[PDB]
């Protein structure tokens, strides 16, 4: 991608987490960075 243009994390359900992180629950989306999960609340 050139620009965030997509289904992001934050937007449908949650924020980015980093792979360490509480997730009251995971969800999918689009995170720019790593093994960064979409995680509706911590």
Same mark, same amino acid.
């Given at each position: ?7 992001? &994390? ?8 980093? =792979?360490?992180?509480?997730?009251? /629950? /995971?969800?999918?989306? !689009?995170? =720019? !960075?790593?093994?960064?999960? &979409?995680?509706? /609340?911590?």
């Amino acid at each position: 991608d050139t620009t965030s243009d997509f289904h992001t &994390c934050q937007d449908k359900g949650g924020h980015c987490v980093s =792979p360490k992180i509480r997730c009251l /629950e /995971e969800q999918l989306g !689009l995170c =720019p !960075l790593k093994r960064w999960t &979409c995680c509706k /609340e911590i």
